[PDB]
Nucleic acid binder design. Sequence first.
RNA 1: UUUUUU
RNA 2: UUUUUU
RNA 3: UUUUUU
Lengths: 388, 388, 50
Amino acid sequence: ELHGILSLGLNVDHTIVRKKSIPLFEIGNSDQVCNWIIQIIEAGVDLQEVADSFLTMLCVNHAYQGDPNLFLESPAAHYLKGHGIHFEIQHRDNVDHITDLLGVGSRDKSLRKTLSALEFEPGGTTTAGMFLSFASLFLPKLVVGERACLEKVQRQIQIHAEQGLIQYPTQWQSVGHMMVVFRLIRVNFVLKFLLVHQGMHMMAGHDANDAIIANSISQTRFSGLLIVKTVLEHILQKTEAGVQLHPLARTSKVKGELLAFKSALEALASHREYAPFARLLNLSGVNNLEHGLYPQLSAIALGVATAHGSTLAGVNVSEQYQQLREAATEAEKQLQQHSEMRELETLGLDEQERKILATFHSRKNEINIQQTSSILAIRKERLRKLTE
Amino acid sequence: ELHGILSLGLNVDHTIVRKKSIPLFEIGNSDQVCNWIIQIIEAGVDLQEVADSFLTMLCVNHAYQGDPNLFLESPAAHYLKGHGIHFEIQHRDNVDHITDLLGVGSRDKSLRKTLSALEFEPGGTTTAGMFLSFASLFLPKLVVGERACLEKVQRQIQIHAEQGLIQYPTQWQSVGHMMVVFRLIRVNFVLKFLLVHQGMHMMAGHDANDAIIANSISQTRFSGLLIVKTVLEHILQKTEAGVQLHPLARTSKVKGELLAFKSALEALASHREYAPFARLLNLSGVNNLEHGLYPQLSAIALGVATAHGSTLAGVNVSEQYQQLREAATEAEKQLQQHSEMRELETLGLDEQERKILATFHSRKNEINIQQTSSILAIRKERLRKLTE
Amino acid sequence: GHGIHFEIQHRDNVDHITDLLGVGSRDKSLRKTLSALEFEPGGTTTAGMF
RNA sequence: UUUUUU
RNA sequence: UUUUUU
RNA sequence: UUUUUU
């Protein structure tokens, strides 16, 4: 095969090319230490290296009541092993301040200056679970950007307060605090992976915070992977007999992009349970799935998908995909109407049964058009009010 | 075979014809030493021999937390072994200045004068990972030249800042600093190979810097090898039944170039995972793949490729390939339209299904023509504004 | 059967009469004249009447 | 010598 | 680079 | 996020 050159170095075998070691602390006052860490985050000081260790300890306090010996035996730590990430257990007896967990060295010595200056509140009421839930609120639409993150987080805050599930501290719902939390969970990988694992693997026994985390993980599936959903659901549509190709995707240049996309999906399927979270977790073969590598396939698939529903009309695209998207959308509208008349005729139904279903279909289309127009106006208003 | 003479000395067996030994240092203050090295680079002093050692230590600080004992066991060092490149571990106890890592000898004695004169900043905030990411930003379009390097780097700087991923020091985003970094990573081989290996082999667990490096390595595939992509995707197009030859490539003189090109691709395939990076890494058989050895094949392939998309119209060629490229492009346009009418007719579709797809195809072609004209105007404007 | 055939050519946005015209010497000459006319934006005359 | 978009 | 609704 | 009656 002389054409395999184009696929060289894409779906490479699993290999460990790093060594990362994280210190976990066996202590007695795990709750107090976690409260101190939460206060440290609230202040907004950057955690150079101890961010990973502090957030992992915050996670093991919520998942395993605070002892890391049980965490190293968990499936999460087993998965992190094999990618070069290991955890260290280190006993401490008297932890009167947060700083004696820090080591010695240039960065630790620099950060000790700042952590020594804070006035920690001796009595505080905030568990690790509350912080973990608030952080999980950011996971859907995290790859979109700051605006969408904060917007969705507020929306979810009302959704969870009305549900009578949790109340968050008022200082947590300010723009500044949300901004620092966005920094923190955008940069860090271990926190996001631990949230994903806990959310999508706890089969029962959810607390309030566990319920919130599970919901947020469910809402995060295929975030940043809209191309996969659109292509698989509409372009490479599967039927009872086989994989039917859509009529709008039979252009010659689309076919090559479709072949390469099949290969890229084949690579993405390697991460079994975490494939829906590839863009969030920055897994290996996720840069191979981009608009820009498959310009017209992406535009056509999004247009075909937009033709069906009414909320996909609010998805923005770059300057160079709008017109092809609209053309595909209108073509799919006309094709869908034609197929619906033919399928209505082929069905075994009466005269009155015709007319009931036909009036219903007309009303359905009308509702769909009206809702799509409303969504388009909403998107235009949002965009044009952003830029003022 | 009397014709094998023309292929003598092209795909030669693997053999080691060099011996290169690099000293790696086992120390305690790896972070401080790396900060000193970064400051040395920031000043702009040339590193005669210690460039390789300093950058390799900078890489092992980011990949393995700073101990070279783990790096010598890595697959990267195993690959470098077998090409005559070895690493030396050398313990040091008290490293109070950068200069005591240097040895004794004419070049070291000369460079000690300069490194003794710098005023190193005792406290600095810049990891090895940040420098490695900034250097990886240069890898795509590195073989093009200084202009494209700096242009793409700035574009990526906005892309990564808007994504909320990293912030770089302001002095790093000046033309002078980018210029010295271009010198440094253009000359050095070990740094580029280490960046490539880390980017394309880390399957999961990416940090922010690891994510940036992986993205930049993904964008670097087949950089400087546009001829391979064009020929393999269009000229030697492969089908369900075999490798179809394009109609425009059946001229007699193109056939011999195509045979030689098949041999050259056969040689290039020897480097399995690093074939996409052959021109960047200056691998063995990459001078055998040039425009100039295959003049008309290159021109025809680029023209056929340009006919399909709209961004390939911005690729420049030499004085002696423009007209053949344009002729091939126009011929491919007409052939593509003919094939599209025939393929539309052969498909099993209705009357209305005709007209929907035919209007869609017309709109698609119109959009394509408009975008190609815009890109051509952009290229003309860029070139004619460069030369003023 | 007498050598006269018709071509179907799709156009999306026809804001003026001139963009139906092609490119060429005669079309380029006639575009000058059709560009100078002041077409009446609202008119009441069908093709059937003509 | 490379020249586009990602 | 991502862009919707959930 | 759920929305009725039992």
